Design a protein around this ligand. Structure first.
Ligand SMILES: [Mg+2]
Ligand SMILES: [Mg+2]
Ligand SMILES: [Mg+2]
Ligand SMILES: [Mg+2]
Ligand SMILES: [Mg+2]
Ligand SMILES: [Mg+2]
Ligand SMILES: [Mg+2]
Ligand SMILES: [Mg+2]
Ligand SMILES: [Mg+2]
Ligand SMILES: [Mg+2]
Ligand SMILES: [Mg+2]
Ligand SMILES: [Mg+2]
Ligand SMILES: [Mg+2]
Ligand SMILES: [Mg+2]
Ligand SMILES: [Mg+2]
Ligand SMILES: [Mg+2]
Ligand SMILES: [Mg+2]
Ligand SMILES: [Mg+2]
Ligand SMILES: [Mg+2]
Ligand SMILES: [Mg+2]
Ligand SMILES: [Mg+2]
Ligand SMILES: [Mg+2]
Ligand SMILES: [Mg+2]
Ligand SMILES: [Mg+2]
Ligand SMILES: [Mg+2]
Ligand SMILES: [Mg+2]
Ligand SMILES: [Mg+2]
Ligand SMILES: [Mg+2]
Ligand SMILES: [Mg+2]
Ligand SMILES: [Mg+2]
Ligand SMILES: [Mg+2]
Ligand SMILES: [Mg+2]
Ligand SMILES: [Mg+2]
Ligand SMILES: [Mg+2]
Ligand SMILES: [Mg+2]
Ligand SMILES: [Mg+2]
Ligand SMILES: [Mg+2]
Ligand SMILES: [Mg+2]
Ligand SMILES: [Mg+2]
Ligand SMILES: [Mg+2]
Ligand SMILES: [Mg+2]
Ligand SMILES: [Mg+2]
Ligand SMILES: [Mg+2]
Ligand SMILES: [Mg+2]
Ligand SMILES: [Mg+2]
Ligand SMILES: [Mg+2]
Ligand SMILES: [Mg+2]
Ligand SMILES: [Mg+2]
Ligand SMILES: [Mg+2]
Ligand SMILES: [Mg+2]
Ligand SMILES: [Mg+2]
Ligand SMILES: [Mg+2]
Ligand SMILES: [Mg+2]
Ligand SMILES: [Mg+2]
Ligand SMILES: [Mg+2]
Ligand SMILES: [Mg+2]
Ligand SMILES: [Mg+2]
Ligand SMILES: [Mg+2]
Ligand SMILES: [Mg+2]
Ligand SMILES: [Mg+2]
Ligand SMILES: [Mg+2]
Ligand SMILES: [Mg+2]
Ligand SMILES: [Mg+2]
Ligand SMILES: [Mg+2]
Ligand SMILES: [Mg+2]
Ligand SMILES: [Mg+2]
Ligand SMILES: [Mg+2]
Ligand SMILES: [Mg+2]
Ligand SMILES: [Mg+2]
Ligand SMILES: [Mg+2]
Ligand SMILES: [Mg+2]
Ligand SMILES: [Mg+2]
Ligand SMILES: [Mg+2]
Ligand SMILES: [Mg+2]
Ligand SMILES: [Mg+2]
Ligand SMILES: [Mg+2]
Ligand SMILES: [Mg+2]
Ligand SMILES: [Mg+2]
Ligand SMILES: [Mg+2]
Ligand SMILES: [Mg+2]
Ligand SMILES: [Mg+2]
Ligand SMILES: [Mg+2]
Ligand SMILES: [Mg+2]
Ligand SMILES: [Mg+2]
Ligand SMILES: [Mg+2]
Ligand SMILES: [Mg+2]
Ligand SMILES: [Mg+2]
Ligand SMILES: [Mg+2]
Ligand SMILES: [Mg+2]
Ligand SMILES: [Mg+2]
Ligand SMILES: [Mg+2]
Ligand SMILES: [Mg+2]
Ligand SMILES: [Mg+2]
Ligand SMILES: [Mg+2]
Ligand SMILES: [Mg+2]
Ligand SMILES: [Mg+2]
Ligand SMILES: [Mg+2]
Ligand SMILES: [Mg+2]
Ligand SMILES: [Mg+2]
Ligand SMILES: [Mg+2]
Ligand SMILES: [Mg+2]
Ligand SMILES: [Mg+2]
Ligand SMILES: [Mg+2]
Ligand SMILES: [Mg+2]
Ligand SMILES: [Mg+2]
Ligand SMILES: [Mg+2]
Ligand SMILES: [Mg+2]
Ligand SMILES: [Mg+2]
Ligand SMILES: [Mg+2]
Ligand SMILES: [Mg+2]
Ligand SMILES: [Mg+2]
Ligand SMILES: [Mg+2]
Ligand SMILES: [Mg+2]
Ligand SMILES: [Mg+2]
Ligand SMILES: [Mg+2]
Ligand SMILES: [Mg+2]
Ligand SMILES: [Mg+2]
Ligand SMILES: [Mg+2]
Ligand SMILES: [Mg+2]
Ligand SMILES: [Mg+2]
Ligand SMILES: [Mg+2]
Ligand SMILES: [Mg+2]
Ligand SMILES: [Mg+2]
Ligand SMILES: [Mg+2]
Ligand SMILES: [Mg+2]
Ligand SMILES: [Mg+2]
Ligand SMILES: [Mg+2]
Ligand SMILES: [Mg+2]
Ligand SMILES: [Mg+2]
Ligand SMILES: [Mg+2]
Ligand SMILES: [Mg+2]
Ligand SMILES: [Mg+2]
Ligand SMILES: [Mg+2]
Ligand SMILES: [Mg+2]
Ligand SMILES: [Mg+2]
Ligand SMILES: [Mg+2]
Ligand SMILES: [Mg+2]
Ligand SMILES: [Mg+2]
Ligand SMILES: [Mg+2]
Ligand SMILES: [Mg+2]
Ligand SMILES: [Mg+2]
Ligand SMILES: [Mg+2]
Ligand SMILES: [Mg+2]
Ligand SMILES: [Mg+2]
Ligand SMILES: [Mg+2]
Ligand SMILES: [Mg+2]
Ligand SMILES: [Mg+2]
Ligand SMILES: [Mg+2]
Ligand SMILES: [Mg+2]
Ligand SMILES: [Mg+2]
Ligand SMILES: [Mg+2]
Ligand SMILES: [Mg+2]
Ligand SMILES: [Mg+2]
Ligand SMILES: [Mg+2]
Ligand SMILES: [Mg+2]
Ligand SMILES: [Mg+2]
Ligand SMILES: [Mg+2]
Ligand SMILES: [Mg+2]
Ligand SMILES: [Mg+2]
Ligand SMILES: [Mg+2]
Ligand SMILES: [Mg+2]
Ligand SMILES: [Mg+2]
Ligand SMILES: [Mg+2]
Ligand SMILES: [Mg+2]
Ligand SMILES: [Mg+2]
Ligand SMILES: [Mg+2]
Ligand SMILES: [Mg+2]
Ligand SMILES: [Mg+2]
Ligand SMILES: [Mg+2]
Ligand SMILES: [Mg+2]
Ligand SMILES: [Mg+2]
Ligand SMILES: [Mg+2]
Ligand SMILES: [Mg+2]
Ligand SMILES: [Mg+2]
Ligand SMILES: [Mg+2]
Ligand SMILES: [Mg+2]
Ligand SMILES: [Mg+2]
Ligand SMILES: [Mg+2]
Ligand SMILES: [Mg+2]
Ligand SMILES: [Mg+2]
Ligand SMILES: [Mg+2]
Ligand SMILES: [Mg+2]
Ligand SMILES: [Mg+2]
Ligand SMILES: [Mg+2]
Ligand SMILES: [Mg+2]
Ligand SMILES: [Mg+2]
Ligand SMILES: [Mg+2]
Ligand SMILES: [Mg+2]
Ligand SMILES: [Mg+2]
Ligand SMILES: [Mg+2]
Ligand SMILES: [Mg+2]
Ligand SMILES: [Mg+2]
Ligand SMILES: [Mg+2]
Ligand SMILES: [Mg+2]
Ligand SMILES: [Mg+2]
Ligand SMILES: [Mg+2]
Ligand SMILES: [Mg+2]
Ligand SMILES: [Mg+2]
Ligand SMILES: [Mg+2]
Ligand SMILES: [Mg+2]
Ligand SMILES: [Mg+2]
Ligand SMILES: [Mg+2]
Ligand SMILES: [Mg+2]
Ligand SMILES: [Mg+2]
Ligand SMILES: [Mg+2]
Ligand SMILES: [Mg+2]
Ligand SMILES: [Mg+2]
Ligand SMILES: [Mg+2]
Ligand SMILES: [Mg+2]
Ligand SMILES: [Mg+2]
Ligand SMILES: [Mg+2]
Ligand SMILES: [Mg+2]
Ligand SMILES: [Mg+2]
Ligand SMILES: [Mg+2]
Ligand SMILES: [Mg+2]
Ligand SMILES: [Mg+2]
Ligand SMILES: [Mg+2]
Lengths: 47, 272
RNA sequence: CGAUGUCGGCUCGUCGCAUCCUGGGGCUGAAGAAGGUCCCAAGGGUUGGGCUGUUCGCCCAUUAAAGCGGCACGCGAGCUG
RNA sequence: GAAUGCCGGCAUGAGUAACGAUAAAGAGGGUGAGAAUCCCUCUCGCCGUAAGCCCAAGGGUUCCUACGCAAUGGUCGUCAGCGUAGGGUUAGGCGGGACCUAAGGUGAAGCCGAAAGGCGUAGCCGAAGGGCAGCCGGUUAAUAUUCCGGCCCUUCCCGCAGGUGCGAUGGGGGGACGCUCUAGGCUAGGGGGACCGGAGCCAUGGACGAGCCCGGCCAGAAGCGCAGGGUGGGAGGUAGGCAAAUCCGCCUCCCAACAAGCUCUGCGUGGUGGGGAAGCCCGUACGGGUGACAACCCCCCGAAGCCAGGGAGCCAAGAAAAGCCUCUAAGCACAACCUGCGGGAACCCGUACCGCAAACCGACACAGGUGGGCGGGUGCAAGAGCACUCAGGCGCGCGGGAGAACCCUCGCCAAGGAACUCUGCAAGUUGGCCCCGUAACUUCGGGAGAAGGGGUGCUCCCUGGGGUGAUGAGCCCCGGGGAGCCGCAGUGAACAGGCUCUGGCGACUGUUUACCAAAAACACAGCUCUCUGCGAACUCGUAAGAGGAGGUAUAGGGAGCGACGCUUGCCCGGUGCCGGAAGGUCAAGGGGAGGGGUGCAAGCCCCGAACCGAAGCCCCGGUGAACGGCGGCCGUAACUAUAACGGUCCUAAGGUAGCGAAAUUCCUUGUCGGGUAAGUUCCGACCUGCACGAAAAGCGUAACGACCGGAGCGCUGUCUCGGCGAGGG
RNA sequence: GAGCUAGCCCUGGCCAGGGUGAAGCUGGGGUGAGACCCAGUGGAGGCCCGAACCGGUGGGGGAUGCAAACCCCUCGGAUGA
RNA sequence: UGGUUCGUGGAGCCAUGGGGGAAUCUGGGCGGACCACCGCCUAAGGCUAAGUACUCCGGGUGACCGAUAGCGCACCAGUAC
RNA sequence: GGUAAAAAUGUU
RNA sequence: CGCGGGGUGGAGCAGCCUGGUAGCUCGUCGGGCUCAUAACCCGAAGGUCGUCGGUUCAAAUCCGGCCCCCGCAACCA
RNA sequence: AGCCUACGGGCAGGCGCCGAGGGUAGGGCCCGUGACUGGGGCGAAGUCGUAACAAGGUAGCUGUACCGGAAGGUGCGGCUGGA
RNA sequence: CGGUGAAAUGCGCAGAUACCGGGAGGAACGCCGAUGGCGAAGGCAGCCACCUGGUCCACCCGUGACGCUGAGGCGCGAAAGCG
């Protein structure tokens, strides 16, 4: 049947994108934890 | 002059449609100070507040002159009687001699091609607006303002009407459609006559879908729920309320009054 | 109880005898036929339906007879549910 | 040495199950170290409202070519969506952006919040919506509405030429709209042809024949032509469209009333440009030439698409802003704008490829899921159905043998027909169209496809309407009658209701436990109670704010009951709610009688009784479609039996109507009656209702149901009771 | 975290083909005028049959599956909630 | 009401949200209710090094480890997945 | 006259 | 078998807790009223308090044991 | 494919329509019967009450509606077969 | 206070009945008024206006036998009752 992952570039970049993280104080702490950990990708890779 | 249907399918033997003969030949609308975009929405910023709203047909908001002191002394010609989906009552297109076009909420007996005027002068003929201090005692009236210069806020559903019972100082006493006797200030305008489309009470929606056409989603009884959701819920089959009857939020719903007791408007109210 | 799946049916049986019938026998208030009761005997046989989930039971039509029980109230790594 | 311990390695099951739809394979010839699996050719099979083409999303090199087979491929592999390398995506006109707005997001002003932050008018963002200028062919191994060819357009900017008061984000018009059914005329698409153009072919008994086979097109400015959509023209007067208007609006007499006329599309026709089969010959995986100077014509069917903003009907009353036209404001009238021509300028992103799938979502080359358009022909009444088949694409990436049990998926059967069984579960029967014919009941619609029947193919003759053609031929759609022919059988294959009688529940269509429950549960129109006079009640939120509602008692919220019909009895004692400016009680506070602690005292500090003190509670009333409740023991009548009647006790009042062994009845398989040969089920009754009962409704009710129970007819491998055959294991 | 699912808001799209023939118009009849009755026209409907589409009733298969909900036959809705 | 050892305790002191509401040396706070005596401070404005805490970074040292250990990573690791 | 009220039963 | 309440004149009910004395209504009996009955009026009678025991000076009353009656309970697999 | 006497004929035979009747299916009318149930009538001298006839001790009757063991009671309007 | 043959329930010191003044609301129309009138019956009663029917008289003017009854049908039809 219909599974959970149905991709959308529009949905992925507006929900998990960098600018959506920097709006909220919660997403600003998300990137802070990812800078500190050493992640190569702070955000999901969207093209 | 309610339309009946034959029982050619079920839910048409009971189904009932209002009569549209008072609607003159004006099925589309006027514009530019006439329908705005109407925002459909069942809910506030976010969560649902009035449960069981949604769906329904798309509507455009016919913007109505509720404050008819704008054109005191300026007469009008009744050009049309139209359908308003936003209201139980009908609406009347007026062309002014001044040149404007507005809708007044259409009273009963108002015919097309009739002079109608607002103001203190304003003879007592159906559709004319006056202050309450100038209208004779005993005449039925509608579109009544509550406080002066604030807009018509009383007796504007279909077939409703308010009646003047007396005067007392700067205030007059109105018998509302609720039967409440209320002191309303004399400078409040009010349009004489009943509202009409009085057959709106006698409609039968016939089927479940006709309520969905009006935006009325189905209403779930609390007794058909679980006790997380409602006080009446729960119980192995069909409990009989188990408690004094209450809302989903706990407040009782059989007789419990909830008017704010210390309201400053209470010293203008005489009856129920 | 870090699992022994429970009634009833179906399929498949096997065993016990304190035997329903068939076989042999004593007594009879056994004339004969047909019974009663008891002893020997398990070699084989022990029907088809209506009702009910039923085991059982009660009916219908028969029959030489329509036997009782055990095997985790036999049998769900065989089935039904 | 153990922790169903952790990590890693290797055994066992085991050469066992499996190798992923039962659409299907066989041969020849190449290549090669190595071929069932790669290439080619012939034959066979499968899809064909797709298993074929074109888009969108997603995927991101998978595209093309060259060299290759370690691993990936459920086998092999010389192949590949795989490894190395190289090549490939060309735009003023397609899509998106230098255009607009919707929901929603954001948000100068402003309001709010311990902080973080939450709202919020204008604005801005926001798109498959509005707006907007390219059609047909040809080329590459791989791109084209992008490059090339022909024809045609759109913006700007600079020039001269001719017109006009020009002129804004401001005013107005327009943009601009539903659902359903539809008229006229075209187009797309399709069919036929004695006509036109063709390489060729007479096979096996016959045929040189209006023979067979193949093909008879596409785009195309201005200009006409045919359909069609939009719209009145003046004159004044004018307070409104938040400044101004000659515009719009509103009045008023004049002329039109029509599309006459202006425009604006669509479709033909059009200068000219392009394509062009079968078959044959070849050298490639893929194409190329000839056929051809190709012909390029006539009929008929015809849309759900076009003319579009068409028409009619209906209620549930059917987006916004910009572009566009017009109007005037500052300002400007050497400017500026409109029209025509000329030259110049025309940027950013995407363009490969897969795309109902081996490239997307499912860990897989997974029998799953995935939005829009084209989707041909013939026959079956119709059709996107069903069978076959064009174009096109495939034979599903293990095969070969055998012909056991057993399993799956099928086929058939003697005699019996439900004896099977929880149950006719399953499988059969019936099945489409036409024509007869059709019950109780009923809300007069229905029930109804009731039930039960008959006809159905083919040839010949005669004959009635239409549509396109001119009133005719032809081509097409519908009919009627008569005479015959063949077979076991004529919707001869495939697609295609078994029916009736009777109860239970729910009125009905609908909704639900995604993944064991689709129901009698939920919902539902409808009925009643109750709250709510508007800054409403209620809801979310600390607030602001917002929903309700841009609503106003015919409205909104809450609760129950659930169409409809006839009805919904008694109890306010207790609980709840409603109504009572008395009284009792009652907290902070007021009040100070009186007392205490210290001081040499003025004083300073503690407690502190009367009394005045709200809601709430107590008290008095009311209220059942508010929470709820609706009796016990005795005796009695011309035979028993029973008790209309009575006595007594208790309660706040003591179950009325209507139903009743019921979805409710323990004893119980109650007892009669019916169906049966036989009936713990079913139906009709009796009432001794353990333990019905009136809006947690009562009793009924036509129609309705993948609900539940009972019966009968038809039919059958369900069974007696099995047997044989098929295919995949 | 609402790219699954539940609801709603904005905006687009889809629903082959057959049946049944409500209102209303037109004409006739009727009346003092009506109601009303016939025809023809008309095409209404949480209408009927049935594909796409949305579902998931009964049975069989499947059960280390093709599949962590599948497949075949059968079945419900299919202009509307 | 909070803070202090202090949980209403005899509950001061220090801060406070609400109500009343002064004084400028004969002024005011405190010394654990309160009063008296004896004493200590001088509130309702602000700044102020040093000694103190920590280790992303550099160095030294180790009765610290030695690729299942030592950081998750000795190896292009916050990577592949 | 337009103008007021009293408690069972009895064989044929 | 469990828990709770009950048995009192002929019928139905009190009185039992807090031992000393048994009351109410209807009925029965006797007498009135009536022609006669019922209704009504005036009198009167009637109870081993289910039994068997023991507590006490003393038991309907308190305690136990049996016999009946009413109500509830009898669950999970 | 038979037989004939006068044969472009007849008989037998064959095909066909109607066809008594039988079969299947569905309606209509009527009769008998049926657990149980309703009310009617006559019966032995039964039980309960007093409705009506006298102002029958609430004038009576009546159509309708509701209620009650039962006659009946009451509401609305009517009647004189009462004052 | 109500109420009756008499009482009782009930209402009332929470300020009733009785009284005055004001306000709302519905239904029925005293006196006239009766053995009266009208109408086909049922039935019709304050007053005003509009719309409308039947009928009586006088004049003897016009038509000129047009008449009477009426199975059905159609319409009206107190009160109670139903939506
Ligand atoms: Mg989305
Ligand atoms: Mg505008
Ligand atoms: Mg918002
Ligand atoms: Mg938000
Ligand atoms: Mg509901
Ligand atoms: Mg539930
Ligand atoms: Mg929840
Ligand atoms: Mg709760
Ligand atoms: Mg229950
Ligand atoms: Mg409950
Ligand atoms: Mg165990
Ligand atoms: Mg253990
Ligand atoms: Mg074990
Ligand atoms: Mg023996
Ligand atoms: Mg023997
Ligand atoms: Mg013997
Ligand atoms: Mg013997
Ligand atoms: Mg003998
Ligand atoms: Mg059975
Ligand atoms: Mg047993
Ligand atoms: Mg045995
Ligand atoms: Mg046992
Ligand atoms: Mg067993
Ligand atoms: Mg099993
Ligand atoms: Mg078993
Ligand atoms: Mg076993
Ligand atoms: Mg075992
Ligand atoms: Mg079961
Ligand atoms: Mg089952
Ligand atoms: Mg170990
Ligand atoms: Mg291991
Ligand atoms: Mg091994
Ligand atoms: Mg082997
Ligand atoms: Mg092998
Ligand atoms: Mg093995
Ligand atoms: Mg094997
Ligand atoms: Mg195998
Ligand atoms: Mg495979
Ligand atoms: Mg395969
Ligand atoms: Mg070779
Ligand atoms: Mg095929
Ligand atoms: Mg896209
Ligand atoms: Mg893409
Ligand atoms: Mg991928
Ligand atoms: Mg690659
Ligand atoms: Mg190669
Ligand atoms: Mg390889
Ligand atoms: Mg290599
Ligand atoms: Mg391999
Ligand atoms: Mg090779
Ligand atoms: Mg490739
Ligand atoms: Mg490659
Ligand atoms: Mg630019
Ligand atoms: Mg630029
Ligand atoms: Mg844009
Ligand atoms: Mg933009
Ligand atoms: Mg914008
Ligand atoms: Mg906004
Ligand atoms: Mg801030
Ligand atoms: Mg915001
Ligand atoms: Mg767009
Ligand atoms: Mg667009
Ligand atoms: Mg474009
Ligand atoms: Mg390509
Ligand atoms: Mg091209
Ligand atoms: Mg070009
Ligand atoms: Mg101008
Ligand atoms: Mg504008
Ligand atoms: Mg064409
Ligand atoms: Mg054509
Ligand atoms: Mg030719
Ligand atoms: Mg030949
Ligand atoms: Mg052709
Ligand atoms: Mg004009
Ligand atoms: Mg102006
Ligand atoms: Mg015209
Ligand atoms: Mg052309
Ligand atoms: Mg042209
Ligand atoms: Mg060619
Ligand atoms: Mg070729
Ligand atoms: Mg139109
Ligand atoms: Mg607009
Ligand atoms: Mg704008
Ligand atoms: Mg325009
Ligand atoms: Mg491309
Ligand atoms: Mg492409
Ligand atoms: Mg597709
Ligand atoms: Mg998976
Ligand atoms: Mg694989
Ligand atoms: Mg995949
Ligand atoms: Mg993959
Ligand atoms: Mg495969
Ligand atoms: Mg797949
Ligand atoms: Mg799909
Ligand atoms: Mg087609
Ligand atoms: Mg076709
Ligand atoms: Mg066809
Ligand atoms: Mg044919
Ligand atoms: Mg067909
Ligand atoms: Mg199509
Ligand atoms: Mg098909
Ligand atoms: Mg092919
Ligand atoms: Mg055969
Ligand atoms: Mg057979
Ligand atoms: Mg046979
Ligand atoms: Mg048979
Ligand atoms: Mg049977
Ligand atoms: Mg059996
Ligand atoms: Mg059955
Ligand atoms: Mg079946
Ligand atoms: Mg058949
Ligand atoms: Mg029926
Ligand atoms: Mg019919
Ligand atoms: Mg039929
Ligand atoms: Mg039927
Ligand atoms: Mg034939
Ligand atoms: Mg044509
Ligand atoms: Mg013609
Ligand atoms: Mg035949
Ligand atoms: Mg068929
Ligand atoms: Mg049935
Ligand atoms: Mg039943
Ligand atoms: Mg239902
Ligand atoms: Mg489920
Ligand atoms: Mg689950
Ligand atoms: Mg299910
Ligand atoms: Mg269902
Ligand atoms: Mg109802
Ligand atoms: Mg909120
Ligand atoms: Mg709040
Ligand atoms: Mg608001
Ligand atoms: Mg609103
Ligand atoms: Mg309401
Ligand atoms: Mg409501
Ligand atoms: Mg219900
Ligand atoms: Mg009925
Ligand atoms: Mg009370
Ligand atoms: Mg009560
Ligand atoms: Mg109460
Ligand atoms: Mg109260
Ligand atoms: Mg005090
Ligand atoms: Mg005090
Ligand atoms: Mg004080
Ligand atoms: Mg108080
Ligand atoms: Mg009730
Ligand atoms: Mg007796
Ligand atoms: Mg009694
Ligand atoms: Mg009662
Ligand atoms: Mg029974
Ligand atoms: Mg029986
Ligand atoms: Mg029987
Ligand atoms: Mg029964
Ligand atoms: Mg019974
Ligand atoms: Mg019961
Ligand atoms: Mg019940
Ligand atoms: Mg009940
Ligand atoms: Mg109830
Ligand atoms: Mg119900
Ligand atoms: Mg019932
Ligand atoms: Mg019902
Ligand atoms: Mg029914
Ligand atoms: Mg169902
Ligand atoms: Mg349904
Ligand atoms: Mg049977
Ligand atoms: Mg079989
Ligand atoms: Mg076999
Ligand atoms: Mg086989
Ligand atoms: Mg969603
Ligand atoms: Mg489609
Ligand atoms: Mg249709
Ligand atoms: Mg018609
Ligand atoms: Mg239709
Ligand atoms: Mg339908
Ligand atoms: Mg249906
Ligand atoms: Mg259907
Ligand atoms: Mg789906
Ligand atoms: Mg579902
Ligand atoms: Mg299924
Ligand atoms: Mg299954
Ligand atoms: Mg499928
Ligand atoms: Mg069906
Ligand atoms: Mg503290
Ligand atoms: Mg403290
Ligand atoms: Mg403490
Ligand atoms: Mg303290
Ligand atoms: Mg303070
Ligand atoms: Mg201080
Ligand atoms: Mg202090
Ligand atoms: Mg101190
Ligand atoms: Mg101190
Ligand atoms: Mg001290
Ligand atoms: Mg100090
Ligand atoms: Mg200082
Ligand atoms: Mg420090
Ligand atoms: Mg370091
Ligand atoms: Mg490590
Ligand atoms: Mg090592
Ligand atoms: Mg590690
Ligand atoms: Mg008597
Ligand atoms: Mg007693
Ligand atoms: Mg007693
Ligand atoms: Mg006596
Ligand atoms: Mg006496
Ligand atoms: Mg349990
Ligand atoms: Mg339990
Ligand atoms: Mg249980
Ligand atoms: Mg002759
Ligand atoms: Mg009487
Ligand atoms: Mg009497
Ligand atoms: Mg009387
Ligand atoms: Mg009464
Ligand atoms: Mg009377
Ligand atoms: Mg008199
Ligand atoms: Mg004369
Ligand atoms: Mg009447
Ligand atoms: Mg009446
Ligand atoms: Mg009424």
């Amino acid at each position: 049947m219909k599974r959970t992952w149905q991709p959308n570039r529009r949905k992925r970049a507006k929900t998990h994108g960098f600018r959506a993280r920097m709006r909220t104080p919660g997403g600003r702490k998300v990137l802070k934890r990812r800078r500190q950990k050493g992640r190569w990708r702070l955000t999901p890779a969207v093209r | 002059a309610v339309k009946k249907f034959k029982p050619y399918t079920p839910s048409r033997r009971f189904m009932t449609v209002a009569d549209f003969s008072e609607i003159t030949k004006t099925e589309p609308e006027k514009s530019l100070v006439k329908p705005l975009k109407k925002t459909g929405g069942r809910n506030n910023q976010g969560r649902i507040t009035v449960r069981f709203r949604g769906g329904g047909h798309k509507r455009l908001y016919r913007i109505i002159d509720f404050k008819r002191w704008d054109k005191v002394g300026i007469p009008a010609k009744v050009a049309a009687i139209e359908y308003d989906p936003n209201r139980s009552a009908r609406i009347a297109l007026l062309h002014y001699v001044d040149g404007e076009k507005r809708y007044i909420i259409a009273p009963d007996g108002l015919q097309v091609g009739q002079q109608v005027v607002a103001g203190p002068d304003a003879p007592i003929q159906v559709g004319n607006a006056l202050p309450l201090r100038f209208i004779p005692v005993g005449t039925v009236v509608h579109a009544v303002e509550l406080e002066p210069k604030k807009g018509a806020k009383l007796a504007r559903a279909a077939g409703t009407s308010a009646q003047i019972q007396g005067r007392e100082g700067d205030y007059v006493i109105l018998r509302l459609p609720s039967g409440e006797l209320r002191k309303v200030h004399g400078e409040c305008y009010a349009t004489v006559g009943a509202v009409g489309n009085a057959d709106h009470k006698n409609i039968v929606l016939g089927k479940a879908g006709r309520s969905r056409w009006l935006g009325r989603r189905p209403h779930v009884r609390g007794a058909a729920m679980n006790p997380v959701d409602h006080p009446h819920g729960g119980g192995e089959g069909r409990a009989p309320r188990g408690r004094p009857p209450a809302s989903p939020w706990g407040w009782q719903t059989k007789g419990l009054k909830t008017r704010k007791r210390r309201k400053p408007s209470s010293r203008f109210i005489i009856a129920r």
